[PDB]
């Protein structure tokens, strides 16, 4: 309720400022960064890139991003601690599992996997030091048998420390709802819990039933579109078919239904991308070449001209991602 | 053709010595014992249990082991060096794939691939300088798209190298016959391949079809049996309930073949192992508290009794696997 864990140790709740509540320096496999930089080029090379965008989002009036990476996103927080460093941007680190956990990861119980969520966040992510700040989760579907247990794993865990709970889901398959649902059994406050992806479905009546139990609505990948490049099927499936203004009139619709506390807006975007198709990075980049600056230099002016007030901007991009991310049982 | 490489460094084919073909330290998953060392207890207590271990087996008469464990088993070629060191025994490293890629593996080319696995075995494992010895691979029946392009991947690593190829099979699916076609289509002798876990199948018609047209056979997990345990499900699931003589017998009938000179003998030991059921360690350990000295204390003297000369035992565990490591196109 005073800190926010960083990769470089903890701020205060006014340091955090306009936070892009779901980002990746790097979406890949645990290890694979360390055993084959030259995917990327070269590590330098990604870091200098990351650094870049960082950089230009700050010039744009980012101060903070949530890597929601876990460790089968390979999230290497060494990695970025130097990006944020160097960038002059606050990074909060993930733990949980996303949807690509390994065999050691997937035989596991709901108490093991209690034990290592609790040990990112309460005493550091390898020999690092550096602590999550928040717990992130998946399912494309139903959920598998383990993804039950990493849900309530994730709930135990947030109930112990206060650190709020963020997911994918598969949109149209209206995941949230059993998420919301095992979350709640397990004793889970839906304050502390952001359903995520959930720009990527235009279902009303889905979106409205998880705001109205209070749960935080993620509209978090509005430059994700690949309108313009019907030939790529591989980034037609990854970014979907609807414009980034159709995306972004969802974050209208929540305001003008009395839920404008509850959003959290996000690009997801990344600077590397090894968990997809060869070059997926160029293809993202050429559609959206601002990055992670594409929510301050475009959506926000696209929503003050359909007339949403700065005030109310503000609250979303500065008061949400920071009664969110303080930590509590109820925010 | 002068010299195997280890976690320390180069080798002569006779420093190698009696040398178990299919082993391992750990049993994991990448980034996973950097992330959850408590896991094994610590780190620590995981290395001193190894060289412990490799302690007995080394007084057994073990000189050199192959550790097959790839990145996606974990594979942490520092551990491999300082338990190498600690122990006195040669530890040859391993790349390639087993059965639990990433999504940033499980995306790539047959042509990528080839350049990871060659990364590893030309230039070095990570940022440590170690060069893989082998190259492993795995299928659990019919291989998937995925598993064809890594069968043919490490085809083309091995021609550009000489280094041997090894092979996880369900043998009881006859999965060799498969990868024997994979590999002889790149163009692979199949002098450079053992093809593992034969031992886990009593068709004879299969193994000498193999060993007829030139494979090595991996008679390579003799110590494990799940006789004396029906009431564990998981352990009977992985380890089998053909009893340990059964399995060594295999040794017998192919030299009883004409085939003394492509049987490779191993344990499929580890000394910790997260990629299973929790504690299964123990349970394994209370099977064969001898670990990895099982084959030189218990099967070479078994052996000896069914009427097998010493010296053909001496040419199995010696003289063949200097055959099979020593890096050439044709042994
Ligand atoms: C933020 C302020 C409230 C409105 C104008 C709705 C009354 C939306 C923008
Ligand atoms: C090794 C020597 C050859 C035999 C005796 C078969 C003639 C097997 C043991
Ligand atoms: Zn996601
Ligand atoms: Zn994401
Ligand atoms: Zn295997
Ligand atoms: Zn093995």
């Not at 160097?86 to 065999?103: K, N, R, S, Y």
Request: aromatic share 6%; charged share 20%.
């Amino acid at each position: 309720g005073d800190r926010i864990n960083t990769v470089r140790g903890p701020i205060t709740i006014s340091e955090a400022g306009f936070t892009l509540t779901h980002e990746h320096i790097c979406g890949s496999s645990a290890g694979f960064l360390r055993a084959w930089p030259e995917f990327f080029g070269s590590r330098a090379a990604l870091v200098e890139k990351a650094v870049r965008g960082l950089r230009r989002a700050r010039a744009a009036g980012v101060r903070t991003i949530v890597d929601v990476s876990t460790f089968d996103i390979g999230r290497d927080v060494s990695l970025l601690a130097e990006v944020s460093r160097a960038a002059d941007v606050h990074i909060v680190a993930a733990t949980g599992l996303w949807e690509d956990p390994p065999l050691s990861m997937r035989l596991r119980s709901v108490e093991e996997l209690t034990q290592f969520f609790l040990r990112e966040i309460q005493y550091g992510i390898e020999d690092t030091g550096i602590r999550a700040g928040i717990i992130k989760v998946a399912t494309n579907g139903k959920a598998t048998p383990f993804q039950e247990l990493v849900l309530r794993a994730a709930a135990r865990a947030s109930l112990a420390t206060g650190v709020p709970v963020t997911t994918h889901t598969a949109a149209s398959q209206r995941d949230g709802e059993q998420q919301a649902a095992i979350f709640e059994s397990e004793g889970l406050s839906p304050s502390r819990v952001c359903i995520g992806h959930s720009d990527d479905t235009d279902d009303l009546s889905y979106l409205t039933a998880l705001a109205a139990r209070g749960y935080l609505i993620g509209l978090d990948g509005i430059p994700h579109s690949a309108i313009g490049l019907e030939d790529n099927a591989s980034a037609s499936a990854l970014l979907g078919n609807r414009s980034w203004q159709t995306r972004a009139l969802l974050i209208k619709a929540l305001i003008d239904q009395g839920y404008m506390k509850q959003i959290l807006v996000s690009n997801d975007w990344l600077f590397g991308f090894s968990s997809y198709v060869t070059n997926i990075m160029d293809v993202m980049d050429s559609v959206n070449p601002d990055g992670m600056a594409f929510i301050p230099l475009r959506v926000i002016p696209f929503l003050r001209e359909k007339g949403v007030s700065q005030e109310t901007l503000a609250g979303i991009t500065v008061t949400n991602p920071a009664r969110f991310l303080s930590p509590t049982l109820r925010a």
